[PDB]
Amino acid sequence: VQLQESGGGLVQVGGSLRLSCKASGFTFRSSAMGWYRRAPGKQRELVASLTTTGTADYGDFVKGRFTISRDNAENTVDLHMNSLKPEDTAVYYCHEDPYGMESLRYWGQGTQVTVSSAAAHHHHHH
Ligand code: NA
């Protein structure tokens, strides 16, 4: 089982993103879902997660800027990110934990988020 991220790419400093993850589709059983990130050479760190019951946890660097939600009608876990900073640049990975068991964790493939105003203005034709 591999999940499928979308919504990454280039974004200006101060800009916003809507990250999405197509999960396993096994809505017949509960799960925890969330988002990690990994910057080159650095350790993976928790960005946001939801327990089986919908309790949210956020990495300390989030500082109220990101919101995690899940859509069971659409089989997704989503991350709404505002006020992106250069330091947020990293590969973002979603995950699903069947029955809340991290031991059975499914991961996405990762999607790059690059926070750069000059690059985003160039690429998005602003
Ligand atoms: Na942008």
Q: Which residues hold their Cβ within 5 A of ligand 1, which is an ion?
A: 11-12, 15, 120
The C-alpha angle with vertex 70 and arms to 65 and 76, in degrees rounded to 5, equals 110
For residue 69, give every residue at least 6 positions away whose Cβ sits within 8 Å of its Cβ, in sequence order, or none.
Answer: 50, 77, 78, 80
Provide the 10 A C-beta neighbour count for residue 13: 14
Distance of CA 70 to the CA centre of its chain: 11
Angstrom resolution of this structure: 1.8
Q: How far is the CA of 12 from the centre of ligand 1 (A)?
A: 4
* Residue corresponding to tokens 């992106």: 84
Q: How far is the CA of 75 from the centre of ligand 1 (A)?
A: 26
Q: Which of 32, 19, 39, 49 is nearest to 105 (CA)?
A: 32
Q: How far is the CA of 113 from the centre of ligand 1 (A)?
A: 11
Q: Which uninterrupted H or E stretch holds 5?
A: strand 2-6
* Residue corresponding to tokens 């879902």: 33
CB 57 within 8 A of CB 83: no
d(CA 108, CA 92): 9
Give the technique used to solve this structure: X-ray
